[PDB]
Paper text:
However, only YfiB(59–168) could be crystallized in a complex with a C71S mutant of YfiR; attempts to co-crystallize YfiB(27–168) with wild-type YfiR yielded poorly diffracting crystals. The resulting structure to 1.97 Å resolution reveals one YfiR monomer binds to one monomer of YfiB(59–168). The interface area of the complex is 1,053 Å2, with YfiB burying 1,024 Å2 (16% of the total accessible surface area) and YfiR burying 1,079 Å2 (13% of the total accessible surface area). YfiR interacts with YfiB exclusively through its C-terminal region. Strand β1 of YfiB is completely unwound, allowing strand β7 of YfiR to stack against strand β4 of YfiB in an anti-parallel manner to form an extended β-sheet spanning both proteins. Furthermore, both Glu163 and Ile169 of YfiR, which have previously been shown to interact with YfiN24, also interact with residues in YfiB, suggesting that YfiR uses this same region to bind to both YfiN in the inner membrane and YfiB in the outer membrane. The extensive interface between YfiB and YfiR includes a number of hydrogen bonds and salt bridges: Arg96 of YfiB forms a hydrogen bond with Glu144 of YfiR and a salt bridge with Glu163. Met59 of YfiB inserts into this hydrophobic pocket and interacts with the lining residues such that its side chain is 5.3 Å from Phe151. The choice of a C71S mutant of YfiR breaks the Cys71-Cys110 disulfide bond, but the Cys145-Cys152 disulfide bond remains intact in the C-terminal of the protein upon binding to YfiB. In this arrangement, YfiB binds to each end of the YfiR dimer such that the N-terminal linkers are situated at one side of the complex and the conserved PG-binding sites are located on the opposing side.
The tripartite signalling system YfiBNR in P. aeruginosa modulates intracellular c-di-GMP levels in response to signals received in the periplasm and is a key regulator of the SCV phenotype. The effector protein YfiN (also known as TpbB or PA1120) is an integral inner membrane protein that functions as a diguanylate cyclase, consisting of a periplasmic PAS domain, a cytoplasmic HAMP domain and a catalytic GGDEF domain. The third component of the YfiBNR signalling system, YfiR, has a key role in the signal transduction process by bridging YfiN in the inner membrane and YfiB in the outer membrane. YfiB can release the repression of YfiN by sequestering YfiR at the outer membrane, which requires both membrane anchoring and peptidoglycan binding by YfiB for full activity.
Numbering used by the authors:
A (entry chain B): 56 to 167
B (entry chain A): 40 to 189
Amino acid sequence: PGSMSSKVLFGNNLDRLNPDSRNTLTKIARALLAVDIDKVRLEGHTDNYGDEGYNQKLSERRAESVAAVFREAGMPAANIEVRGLGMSKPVADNKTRAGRSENRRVAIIVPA
Amino acid sequence: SIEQRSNAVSQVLLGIFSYVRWPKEPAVLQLSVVGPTEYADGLLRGMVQANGRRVHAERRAVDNPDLGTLCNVIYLGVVDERERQQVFRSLAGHPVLSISERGTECSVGSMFCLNVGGPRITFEANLDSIARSGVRVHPSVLKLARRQAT
């Protein structure tokens, strides 16, 4: 509901978006660029199931997946940073499937 | 200068507020200052938007049950991870604009994170936080951040 309200959720232990989710992410990056948003930091996250090491690498791959979409959308490669926070920074409760759902994500951050 | 920096925080917040819409637009904007802050004293003295709507600010505790219903804006100071989680659990499902005084991370939590160091106050925006906030943010808000950094 507006380009600034942009959530990017992933399936369980999936580090790539599906055709429809990737499509919807593309028009987000398209929308951001059209309003001069220009540079982004991408931070991937996971639920707290599995090993720390797996999740960290998983969250890295999620963020890189989103980075590849922004690059394809026409945003300069140098203007994109990628981080994985693994499971360290949940937005929702991991003890419910609805919460775990919300933690499987990449947060788009716009730096000054 | 604490005085210079506090007034600049006031002006940047007034700028940010001008790009935000609340689903029920209140007659007065109510702002909660939460956690240790160094630059909020300008806010705490009260502010006025260009159209005359006032911003009334009060300090409130991290563990205030009613944080989400008692304010339209929260200005978040030094909170640890458990306190931050508590705050945003309170805000969940309520239309609340969140801004943190420090921007050392901006990974989870506040929609906007100030950087109150150096020449001009800048900020980052977390679009995932904006998405869970319940308020509407016009993308031109980032012009302000862009121009302040430059």
